[PDB]
Design an enzyme around this catalytic site. Structure first.
Site: not given
Ligand SMILES: Cn1cc(Nc2nc(NC3CCCCC3)c3c(C#N)c[nH]c3n2)cn1
Length: 265
Positions: A19-24, A133
């Site tokens: 998961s990260g921001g609004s992501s999974k 990156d």
């Protein structure tokens, strides 16, 4: 028993990988118990700038995969104003997590992983992307291969504290505001990964304090240590990749003609 449907197929959730921001991202099975990864993006809270990052990832992913199978496959996807679902090739594990299981690295497997990374980064460069990156997290192990998953545009996620050990000198100095994005800076970050794969540590992993770490990356008279090693071609690859001057840093097309890639001993 949680479920996801995408286009006209239903998928069972084994587990959430990350998961990260609004992501999974989820590990899933199709109708036929075949395994996939599904990335979910909740677009409800999403500025028009992030929306375009996700749209750009999907387009390039869809284009870039006809050109190399060292890019993770995007099989199908669904996008509306509220969400995104991406059905993708599911990796056994990412390279950051597989490296932190600080185990032996077979020299032949390190050589072949290197080839994999060069090919993937080469093909994105041919379509005008510099990732900028790169890190081990960006590569997945699939059937004994490394496959790239990010193009460095969208929100980067974490398995379920970022890193700086891979950041190239041009990125630091080009903070004091024609600040070009050179393909050479991916060579540096690939160099750090191979270094880590050779010597068990990032070049400047020793410098635990982080403002001082940034200076070493950019300071000419801070020598990176290249302990002598049986594979003399590999030591040379690491030297040409970690040159602080991007103009004198070796390029990807050069790296593909290098004895370490081309002579199978
Ligand atoms: C740790 N781990 C990873 C897997 N496999 C896997 N991980 C994916 N993302 C992970 C999200 C967290 C950061 C590292 C990558 C994706 C993916 C995307 N995006 C498309 N396919 C995938 N496969 C199994 N264990």
């Amino acid at each position: 028993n949680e479920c996801i449907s995408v286009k006209g197929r239903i998928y069972s959730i084994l587990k959430q990988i990350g998961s990260g921001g609004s992501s999974k991202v989820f590990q899933v099975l199709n109708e036929k118990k075949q395994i996939y990864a599904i990335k979910y993006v909740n677009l409800e809270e999403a500025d028009n700038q992030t929306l375009d990052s996700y749209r750009n990832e999907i387009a390039y992913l869809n284009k870039l995969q006809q050109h190399s199978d060292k890019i993770i496959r995007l099989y199908d996807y669904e996008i509306t104003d509220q969400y995104i679902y991406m059905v993708m090739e599911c990796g056994n594990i990412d390279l950051n997590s597989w490296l932190k299981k600080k185990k032996s690295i077979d020299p032949w497997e390190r050589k072949s992983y290197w080839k994999n990374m060069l090919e993937a980064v080469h093909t994105i460069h041919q379509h005008g992307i510099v990732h900028s990156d790169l890190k081990p997290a960006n590569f997945l192990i699939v059937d004994g291969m490394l496959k790239l998953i990010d193009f460095g545009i969208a929100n980067q996620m974490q398995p379920d504290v970022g890193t700086v050990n891979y950041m190239p000198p041009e990125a630091i100095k080009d903070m004091s505001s024609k600040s070009k994005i050179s393909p050479k800076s991916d060579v540096w970050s690939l160099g750090c990964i191979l270094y880590y794969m050779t010597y068990g540590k990032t070049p400047f992993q020793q410098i635990i304090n982080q403002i001082s770490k940034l200076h070493a990356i950019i300071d000419p008279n801070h020598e990176i240590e290249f302990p002598d090693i049986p594979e003399k071609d590999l030591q040379d690859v690491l030297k040409c990749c970690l040159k602080r001057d991007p103009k004198q840093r070796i390029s990807i097309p050069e790296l593909l003609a290098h004895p370490y890639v081309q002579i199978q001993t």
